[PDB]
UniProtKB/Swiss-Prot annotation, chain A:
Family, as annotated: Belongs to the CEF1 family.
Effect in UniProt of substituting Y94G: No effect. Slower growth and thermosensitivity. Complete loss of function
Function: Involved in pre-mRNA splicing and cell cycle control. Required for the binding of the NTC complex (or PRP19-associated complex) components to the spliceosome to mediate conformational rearrangement or to stabilize the structure of the spliceosome after U4 snRNA dissociation, which leads to spliceosome maturation. Its absence leads to an arrest of the cell cycle, possibly due to the inefficient splicing of TUB1.
DNA-binding region (UniProt annotation): 25-48, 76-98
Effect of mutating W76G: No effect. Slower growth and thermosensitivity. Complete loss of function. Complete loss of function
Miscellaneous remark of the record: Present with 784 molecules/cell in log phase SD medium.
Effect caused by changing W25G: No effect. Slower growth and thermosensitivity. Complete loss of function. Complete loss of function
The species this protein was found in: Saccharomyces cerevisiae (strain ATCC 204508 / S288c) (Baker's yeast)
Disulfide-linked positions: none
Intracellular or extracellular location(s): Cytoplasm; Nucleus
Superkingdom of the source species: Eukaryota
Domain HTH myb-type span(s) in chain numbering: 1-52, 55-102
SUBUNIT field: Belongs to the NTC complex (or PRP19-associated complex), composed of at least CEF1, CLF1, ISY1, NTC20, SNT309, SYF1, SYF2, and PRP19.
Protein name listed in UniProt: Pre-mRNA-splicing factor CEF1
Curated annotation (Swiss-Prot), chain C:
Assembly with partners or alone: Component of the NTR complex (NTC-related complex), composed of NTR1, NTR2 and PRP43. Interacts with CLF1 and NTR2. Interacts with PRP43 and PRP45.
Additional note from the record: Present with 556 molecules/cell in log phase SD medium.
Residues of the full protein shown: 84 to 236 of 708
Job description of the protein: Involved in pre-mRNA splicing and spliceosome disassembly. Promotes release of excised lariat intron from the spliceosome by acting as a receptor for PRP43. This targeting of PRP43 leads to disassembly of the spliceosome with the separation of the U2, U5, U6 snRNPs and the NTC complex.
Protein location: Cytoplasm; Nucleus
Protein name as it appears in the record: Pre-mRNA-splicing factor SPP382
From Swiss-Prot, chain D:
Note: Present with 468 molecules/cell in log phase SD medium.
Annotated stretches, region: Reverse transcriptase homology domain: 64-554
Organism annotation: Saccharomyces cerevisiae (strain ATCC 204508 / S288c)
Segments for region (Linker): 555-794
Span covered, complete protein: 822 to 1641 of 2413
Domain comment in the entry: The MPN (JAB/Mov34) domain has structural similarity with deubiquitinating enzymes, but lacks the residues that would bind the catalytic metal ion. Contains a region with structural similarity to reverse transcriptase, presenting the classical thumb, fingers and palm architecture, but lacks enzyme activity, since the essential metal-binding residues are not conserved.
Function of the molecule: Functions as a scaffold that mediates the ordered assembly of spliceosomal proteins and snRNAs. Required for association of BRR2 with the spliceosomal U5 snRNP, and the subsequent assembly of the U4/U6-U5 tri-snRNP complex. Functions as a scaffold that positions spliceosomal U2, U5 and U6 snRNAs at splice sites on pre-mRNA substrates, so that splicing can occur. Interacts with both the 5' and the 3' splice site, as well as the branch region. Has a role in branch site-3' splice site selection. Associates with the branch site-3' splice 3'-exon region. Also has a role in cell cycle.
Name of the molecule in the record: Pre-mRNA-splicing factor 8
Localization in the cell: Nucleus
Domain of life: Eukaryota
Curated annotation (Swiss-Prot), chain E:
Function: Involved in pre-mRNA splicing and spliceosome disassembly. Promotes release of excised lariat intron from the spliceosome by acting as a receptor for PRP43. This targeting of PRP43 leads to disassembly of the spliceosome with the separation of the U2, U5, U6 snRNPs and the NTC complex.
Compartment(s) where it occurs, according to its Swiss-Prot or TrEMBL record: Cytoplasm; Nucleus
The species this protein was found in: Saccharomyces cerevisiae (strain ATCC 204508 / S288c)
Protein's name in the database: Pre-mRNA-splicing factor NTR2
Coiled-coil segments: none
Subunit text: Component of the NTR complex (NTC-related complex), composed of NTR1, NTR2 and PRP43. Interacts with CLF1, NTR1 and PRP43.
Additional notes on this entry: Present with 892 molecules/cell in log phase SD medium.
Length: 107, 31, 132, 794, 91, 46
């Protein structure tokens, strides 16, 4: 029942945030059917927002990462701030990184 | 001898939120 | 394209049949194994005394390795039989065997009857240095 | 200006004087904003500043815990391998416990609708849901944000955390598992007790009995002195740090679950606009925040008591002691600390001091604290609920002992872990000069007088315990009980709740709410309430005010129109059904009742009988006191032990003749043995702390937080009251003389099922009556009915 | 306060006779329903807080039982497998 | 009994996966250690 995100709905959400601002999410789920506020706001902060950093990882990004993940035991909200990245991107990059060591109409 | 065996042990800012009285207040009424 | 699709489907059906078939075979094998074990046990059941006891112990061990209630009952029956028919070292050995059997695992009842006989003996005891 | 208005209005509400309906709401809003600002400030300053504890102190701490966990030969809790024997059961428990929040709801929200829906699928496929659950335990270290809505108590404002359901399920299961395995491997020693086996007043009683039964304390023989310590640990969950938590959980648990728990606490917190990552402290709303919190508490207590004495209290790992036990009386006397218990934050320590040791402590304390003016007793606090005579007296030996003890224990704990202030603390000194020994646990305030120095032994009311010695069997002390001031104010505040909220919620709804607070208040304190005026008073206004609430519901304040029949009729009667504590005159003029038989018309009046007048009976007599129930519990459980041995030894099954008499007796309430679900319940352990932490994770309270009817059966029966109320006014035949029951034409009561207007009809021939003091007679339009004044619905 | 509600107090007469009777019956069944020696865990810990030739015959039958089931399993599964194989070959 | 067998197969699959995941965490810790140890070695060399 809980839905994934079509590009339709996603676009409507972006235009909505453009009109209504961030804080009025319950007005965003008015436009967007089949979804809730918490879902909307949740996605906008986690994924859709353009200010987020989705980019490749430099050789320094990885060093700094491994450094932190060793320094701070599992806290991926804090670390994410330290890296200025969304968290599950950071965890994704991290797990893939240790694996370097290896051996319509209604819409 | 009982005392030894234990592990351990042997100003005006101008602002409303960062004052001491305030942290007393919220430290109490919020439980 | 149509021909290829048709060919694939039959193969998938065959694979499903194979998946069913292997399992069935395994089951059959298991069944066979069970029957063999039962037969062996029956045959076994069907100094000399000591030897017999040893054999019994071995059988018990085997059973354990390989229902529990049934086994216990059998044990009890055996004990009863022994009693009807009716040294220290032998006793010790028996005890050891019993212990072994318990670890591997009616039994409670059996324990209680023997324990009860021991209790009667103690009560008889109950009923200075020498005594001590 | 805004902040200052928030403070001012709050301290105006604490006194509880004419605050508007909205100002309470608004003020709550301003306080939650301010509180979150303080939180984010603390977290940022921790980033800039760095963690408070220091590496030294941390190393010492970790070392302490390791030394303990070896001393107890403890096995780190494994991860719950699949094919675990109890998996499906622990599932059933957790899922039920989430289900119950929904179950008592008339109407359900969509999010709630989702929460109830997810569980139901859950029942269908446990094995899969286990796969998903444990997969989360491994994979997922990043979680969804958490919402905060501060709920108001009308004095305190307390937080409430709300998590998302998927996370709630894994949190619940993991919680339940940790408590089961933990109690199974005997992690927590005896003296950490907001625990399972004992309800809090039973805890207090066992604490007193514990005090008396142990040797010598009441001996005034030479230099004997006593002190009582009640210390809140202060901020505790707010000072916990994760770098440490991960490691101290590594000791006790597999690194998987430890890392999980540690990560779960770092989550974005959202209230409206405000949002901040939680970088530092504990979030008390997580289902397993209980276990974490207690474990950490133990870590503090090992600092307080030291390794040795702690091993004394908890005894050997082979045979751990009970709550109050020891091996030898030597081990008791070998150390100054005799009783130590920590109930969540609160710490209670009992210190008995010989002249030598006591004078040594005050020597060192005074040695670093010169006090020439003897003014230590000015800032000294003590109980103001008890009267002056029986309060603690202020004398130099006493006071100086108190501040000495508090000084040393003050020192032991580092200011980084917790904060222990002299302000919050209470020290009670039992002295040759002080006959009383004061303390308070939960809401009970307890004055312990040893029968020795009472100078007189008087048979006293049921709000007073008798302390019975384990060996002598003589009664050596009376414990006087009163109701802590705080929970009096909580009661009063709740009544005010019903008042402010029930603007037009109907009489019936109000009555249930009024009863629940009352039943809860008496039952928890049953005995104590008798001795307190303000709880004792307050109520008289509270009922007379609500009655005066219904009286305005038509138009009147007038006595004459309404006879206590309206309010107190049981529901079957169609009376509101409200219970009573107060004084109320059933005027003998209103008992008159007339019936017709084909022979004639007969009348009945008991008014002419002049004796003690008829009064609506009240609770204080009706509710059973504590001491009788504990005694009955002891004898009953003894009897059940025996009969059970009869069934076993004779291989029979229990007759039931014995059982029936004691079936409702006993504090665990024998009936509980035979309930539908024991098979599951034995795998439910840590229920009591879960109940208490239901404060934080959900908005609507559960007014009875001290029992599970599952484990403890059902403690109190009130039906008797209902018959007494019926006969108190005359009885069923009499009661219905007040109603319309004869108008409906039904001949006998028994066949009436029932199903505001309906109310006023049912009682109409009273509410409308010709003995009204003032009113204006108006004949109805086409009928012969006369109306006195104007009654709206009639 | 849903959990702790007092139940259905009876005024009328017989129901008091009826309610008591019902209670008694319930009690009986609870004790009566429960099987002896079934428990242990609830009674113990709950108790704790409060207080302060035949064999041979059986074995033979089981073996026999086992034998029937294995043969049954063999009879039908094998046939099904054979049929499937034949169909595949034809296709 | 075929359906019952299949359910056992499913039970076997999940447990193995769980074991692998647990192995995965310990393995990840070890890998981090190799980097942690390597970094320490680099510091020693410096």
């Amino acid at each position: 029942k809980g839905g994934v995100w079509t590009n339709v709905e996603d676009q409507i959400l972006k235009a909505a945030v453009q009109k209504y601002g961030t804080h009025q999410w319950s007005k965003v789920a008015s436009l967007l059917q089949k979804k809730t506020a918490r879902q909307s706001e949740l996605r906008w902060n986690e994924y859709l927002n353009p200010k987020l950093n989705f980019t490749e990882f430099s050789k320094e990004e990885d060093a700094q990462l491994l450094d932190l993940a060793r320094e701070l035991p599992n806290q991926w909200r804090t670390i994410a701030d330290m890296m200025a990245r969304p968290a599950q991107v950071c965890v994704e990059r991290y797990n893939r990184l240790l694996e370097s060591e290896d051996s319509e109409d209604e819409e | 001898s009982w005392r030894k065996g234990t592990a351990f042990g042997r100003g005006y800012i101008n602002d409303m939120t960062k004052s001491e009285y305030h942290q007393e207040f919220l430290h109490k009424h919020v439980r | 394209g149509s021909g290829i699709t048709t060919p694939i489907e039959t193969q998938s059906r065959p694979m499903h049949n194979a998946g069913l078939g292997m399992f069935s075979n395994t089951n059959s094998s298991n069944y066979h194994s069970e029957n063999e074990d039962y037969l062996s046990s029956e045959d076994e059941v069907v100094v000399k005394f000591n030897k017999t006891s040893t054999e019994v112990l071995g059988e018990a061990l085997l059973n354990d390795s390989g229902v529990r209630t049934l086994r216990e009952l059998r044990l009890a029956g055996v004990q009863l039989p022994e009693s009807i028919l009716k040294a220290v070292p032998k006793p010790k050995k028996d005890v050891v065997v019993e212990i072994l059997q318990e670890l591997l695992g009616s039994l409670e009842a059996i324990r209680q009857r023997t324990s009860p006989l021991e209790v009667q003996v103690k009560e008889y005891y109950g009923q200075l240095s020498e005594l001590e | 200006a805004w902040v200052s208005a928030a403070h001012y209005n709050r301290e105006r509400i604490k006194r509880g004087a004419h605050v508007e309906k909205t100002m309470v709401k608004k003020n709550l809003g301003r306080l939650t904003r301010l509180w979150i600002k303080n939180e984010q400030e603390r977290q940022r300053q921790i980033q800039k500043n760095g963690p408070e504890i220091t590496p030294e102190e941390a190393t010492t701490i970790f070392s302490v815990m390791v030394e303990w966990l070896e001393s107890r030969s403890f096995s780190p809790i494994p991860f719950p391998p699949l094919t675990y024997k109890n998996d499906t059961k622990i599932l059933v428990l957790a899922l039920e416990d989430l289900k119950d929040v929904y179950a008592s709801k008339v109407r359900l929200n969509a999010s709630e609708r989702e929460e109830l829906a997810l569980i139901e699928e859950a029942y269908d496929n446990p094995h899969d849901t286990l796969n998903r659950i444990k997969k989360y335990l491994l994979t997922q270290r990043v979680f969804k944000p958490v919402d905060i809505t501060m709920m108001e108590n009308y004095q305190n404002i307390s937080p409430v955390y709300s998590v998302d359901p998927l996370e709630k399920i894994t949190d619940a299961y993991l919680d339940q598992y940790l408590w089961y395995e933990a109690d199974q491997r005997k992690l927590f020693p005896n003296w950490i007790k907001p625990s399972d086996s004992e309800i809090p007043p039973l805890l207090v009683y066992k604490w007193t009995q514990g005090i008396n039964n142990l040797s010598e304390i009441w001996d005034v023989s030479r230099g004997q002195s006593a002190v009582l310590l009640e210390t809140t640990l202060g901020e505790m969950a707010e000072k916990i740090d994760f770098t440490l938590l991960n490691r101290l959980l590594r000791l006790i648990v597999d690194p998987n679950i430890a890392d999980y728990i540690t990560a779960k606490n770092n989550v974005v917190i959202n209230f409206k606009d405000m949002s901040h990552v939680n970088k530092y402290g504990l979030i008390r709303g997580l289902k397993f925040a209980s276990f974490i919190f207690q474990y950490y508490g133990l870590v503090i207590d090992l600092l307080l008591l030291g390794q040795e004495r702690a091993t004394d209290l908890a005894g050997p790992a082979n045979n751990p002691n009970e709550f109050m036990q020891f091996k030898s009386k030597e081990v008791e006397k070998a150390h100054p600390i005799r009783l130590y218990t920590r109930y969540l934050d609160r710490i209670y320590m009992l210190f008995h001091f010989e002249e030598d040791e006591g004078e040594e402590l005050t020597d060192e304390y005074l040695a670093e604290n010169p006090d020439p003016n003897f003014e230590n007793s000015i800032g000294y606090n003590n109980r103001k609920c008890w009267p002056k005579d029986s309060r603690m007296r202020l004398i130099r030996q006493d006071v100086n002992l108190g501040r000495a003890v508090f000084w040393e224990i003050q020192s032991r704990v580092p200011t980084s872990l917790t904060s222990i202030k002299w302000e919050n603390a209470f020290v009670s000194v039992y002295s040759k000069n002080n006959p009383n020994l004061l303390f308070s646990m939960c809401g009970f305030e307890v004055r312990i007088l040893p029968r020795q120095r009472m100078e007189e032994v008087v048979s006293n009311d049921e709000g007073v315990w008798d302390l019975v010695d384990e060996r002598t069997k003589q009664r050596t002390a009376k414990a006087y009980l009163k109701v802590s001031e705080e929970e009096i104010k909580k009661f009063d505040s709740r009544i005010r709740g019903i008042l402010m909220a029930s603007g037009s919620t109907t009489f019936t709804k109000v009555a249930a709410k009024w009863n629940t607070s009352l039943i809860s208040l008496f039952t928890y304190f049953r005995e104590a309430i008798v001795a307190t005026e303000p709880l004792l008073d307050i109520l008289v206004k509270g009922e007379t005010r609500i009655q005066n609430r219904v009286k305005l519901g038509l138009n009147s304040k007038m006595p004459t129109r309404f006879p206590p029949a309206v309010f107190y009729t049981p529901k079957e009667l169609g009376g509101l059904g409200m219970i009573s504590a107060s004084h109320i005159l059933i005027p003998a003029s209103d008992l008159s009742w007339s019936k017709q038989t084909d022979t004639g018309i007969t009348h009945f009046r008991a008014g002419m009988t002049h004796e003690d007048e008829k009064l609506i009976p009240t609770i204080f007599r009706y509710i059973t006191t504590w001491e009788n129930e504990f005694l009955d519990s002891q004898r009953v459980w003894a009897e059940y032990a025996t009969k059970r041995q009869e069934a076993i030894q004779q291989n029979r099954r229990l007759a039931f003749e014995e059982l029936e008499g004691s079936w409702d007796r006993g504090i665990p309430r024998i009936s509980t043995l035979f309930q539908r679900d024991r098979h599951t319940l034995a795998y439910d352990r840590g229920h009591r702390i879960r109940r208490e932490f239901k404060q934080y994770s959900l908005e609507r309270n559960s007014p009875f937080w001290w029992t599970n009817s599952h484990h403890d059966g059902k403690l109190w029966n009130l039906n008797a009251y209902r018959t007494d109320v019926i006969q108190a006014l005359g009885g069923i035949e009499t009661i219905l003389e007040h109603t319309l029951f004869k108008g409906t034409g039904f001949n006998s009561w028994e066949g009436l099922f029932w199903e505001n207007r309906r109310f006023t009809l049912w009682w109409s021939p009273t509410i409308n009556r010709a003995n009204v003091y003032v009113g204006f007679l108006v004949q109805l339009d086409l009928t012969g009915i006369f109306l006195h004044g104007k009654i709206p619905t009639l | 306060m849903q959990g702790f509600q007092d139940e259905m107090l009876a005024l009328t007469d017989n129901q008091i006779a009826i309610q008591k009777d019902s209670k008694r019956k319930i009690i009986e069944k609870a004790i009566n329903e429960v099987p002896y020696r079934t428990n242990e865990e609830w009674e113990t810990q709950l108790l704790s807080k409060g207080n302060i030739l035949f064999p041979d015959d059986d074995e033979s039958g089981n073996s026999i039982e086992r034998i029937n089931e294995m043969v049954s399993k063999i009879c039908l599964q094998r046939k099904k497998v054979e049929m499937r194989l034949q169909a595949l070959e034809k296709t | 009994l075929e359906k019952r067998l299949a359910k056992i197969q499913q039970e076997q699959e999940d447990d193995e996966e769980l074991e692998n995941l647990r192995k995965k965490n310990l393995e990840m810790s070890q890998r981090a250690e190799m980097i942690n140890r390597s970094k320490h070695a680099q510091q020693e060399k410096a």
